[PDB]
Amino acid sequence: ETLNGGITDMLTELANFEKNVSQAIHKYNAYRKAASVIAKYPHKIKSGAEAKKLPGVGTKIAEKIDEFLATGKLRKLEKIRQDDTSSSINFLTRVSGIGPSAARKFVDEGIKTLEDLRKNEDKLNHHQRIGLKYFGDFEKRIPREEMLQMQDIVLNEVKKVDSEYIATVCGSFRRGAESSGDMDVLLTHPSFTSESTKQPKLLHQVVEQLQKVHFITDTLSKGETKFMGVCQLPSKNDEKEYPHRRIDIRLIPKDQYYCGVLYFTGSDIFNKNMRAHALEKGFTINEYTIRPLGVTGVAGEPLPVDSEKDIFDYIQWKYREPKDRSE
Template sequence: MPSTIITPLFAFTCAFVNKLVHQEKLKSIDELRSHPKRDQLLNKTQQLGLKYLEEFEQKIPRDEMKQMETILLREITAIDNQLRAEIVGSYRRGATASSDIDVLVTHPTVAKLPSLLHKIVETLTKQFHFVTDTISIGDSKFMGVCQIDTSKLHRRIDIRVFPSEQYYCALLYFTGNDQLNRHMRIVAQEQGYKLNEYSIQKVGSTGTLSKPLPVTSERDIFDYLQMDYKEPHERNM
């Protein structure tokens, strides 16, 4: 079986798939698709993972990512000109191809963020027909499926909203890569800070945390940790 079907994202685990194949005597993905009890065996997220399995396995070329970026930024900022959005992950690090689209969004008014996220998704779904399926949506995160047009493959998309005071910590974290994030958290701990995707805080002698330190750019975080700043394309450790 292709590995995508057992990724954590779609709640498939090796144990689950092996049990399912054994119990139902399945030999292939197509057999699972045509199984009369498929909808009972799989939850909604798993059904979407199965539906788009082969498409999700294909990397997204950078040119297509750029087209998606143009669409997303145009439609998001049209909703509210105070919204700021950026495509993060490997795309921001300059990758020639990406596995999915990760979008970070912020707005200076915190109370507006949940309603704005829902408005963004509604616009991309009903008005622009860019979002084709919703996996889940809450107050701060949307997970779904998108497609530029019917000639293109379906792609996975996540949209997260953050208050402006948390935005640059989130931008750093979700740009990655994972190795750099781990390294920076270790440096932060060694220097008496706690760093995560929400904030950087000073750790007191008793272990108490200070209020989040002011962060107005990614460079501020590097400065707090006395590290040389790395441009996004330099973060592939």
Template sequence: HPKRDQLLTKTQQLGLKYLEEFEQKIPREEMTQMETILVREITAIDDQLKAEIVGSYRRGAKASSDIDVLVTHSSATKLPSLLHKIVDILTKKVQFVTDTISIGDSKFMGVCQLDSSKLHRRIDIRVFPSEQYHCALLYFTGNDQLNRHMRIVAQEQGYKLNEYSIQKVGSTGVL
């Protein structure tokens, strides 16, 4: 409906467009196929890149509600155009990404589809410098309850833990 579309944001329009597909869980087998494509295409850009699906998939779940991907480079500390390059390849070269919700220097939110016979799925790709990757891996593997518990334990011992670093409270350096 054209008038309704003018009132909705792009994110809302995509949410409505794919609502029934997004409500269905992604079977682990499909996630594994997606991981193969993502790792192949991302490491083809630079063999020093590492890509990993995190969240419930990394925790071993049989199904997931979306795909969360972490990317890092073994030596680069600044990766300004990397995410745009990854999304461009996943969109144009392999037609895996079908829609972009938002994209910045380090976070992409969008829609992907394994092939035309499969459902559209929500995908988030986050790029982290190598010195932040392990904290990001821990944080984005989760789950939320574990993350809260780890932050409390860290705080009790005088540390601050988040997806970027673990630091002694009051310190500016990363451990």
């Protein structure tokens, strides 16, 4: 956790690089287990060989740990941190809609910066464009004080279109958090579930409302169960308009709401723990359901849930207020 942090960090640097710049998914994946394993390792890695001793740790990595332990740096690390090509790729990627793949293309075309991009807005697609237009706004954290203003709007509009909708804003926003990265809404309706054959309107209707009133400003991707947009809190009394925010709206069959809800509320660590304990209490959990575990190895069948409460109950545990859903 701090006893092999350098090593873990450098390995993650390297790992990322293979994957982002090179196309070395194998290599990439190589660094990853390595860091994962050195990461659990209970002692102070005093040398390559010592390390090598671990699984996932080969000769090449061992080599690398030595240089790093021998000197405060790594030439390779040094050489990559410079290289403009490599850097371009880490930067382009910052745009919403540009992945590594794309970053490689543009660089090879010479587009290496924000300006480059504007000059060539022809070469970017819709998502990528929006991304380019909201680069700043997009990187801006979201303060709870705005989060609440947003939540207030969405929920009110959803209510209007159908008294029967159920919306919930998950995320860390849900677990307390002072600020968040984006708005993530869970959506359901009684008239939509597991068997029930679709109802796309179920989601399209609300998206419309949201744009009707102007909260939603752009559509990144709109499907029949997941919407990827851009919202914005109405600029009050002209002098202070708000930054543009990322938002997601996703439909869920009512019969699988709470597990999702649970789930999305995280945090990752809380999940896991809960997950393992479910496992203990003779259960299974994942994103959509909780199933009683048979003994033959495994087994299925959806246990019926009416709230996050039903879940905990099931695994016989202390209902956890979202705030304490921390670890």
